[PDB]
Design a protein around this ligand. Structure first.
Ligand SMILES: [Zn+2]
Length: 24
């Protein structure tokens, strides 16, 4: 449908986000 990140809301899911440092 529509791809939207959950960390920066760019152009890529939350998995392929260039800032998935939210792993901890
Ligand atoms: Zn992102």
């Amino acid at each position: 449908k529509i791809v939207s990140c959950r960390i920066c809301k760019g152009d890529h899911w939350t998995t392929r986000c260039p800032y998935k440092d939210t792993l901890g």
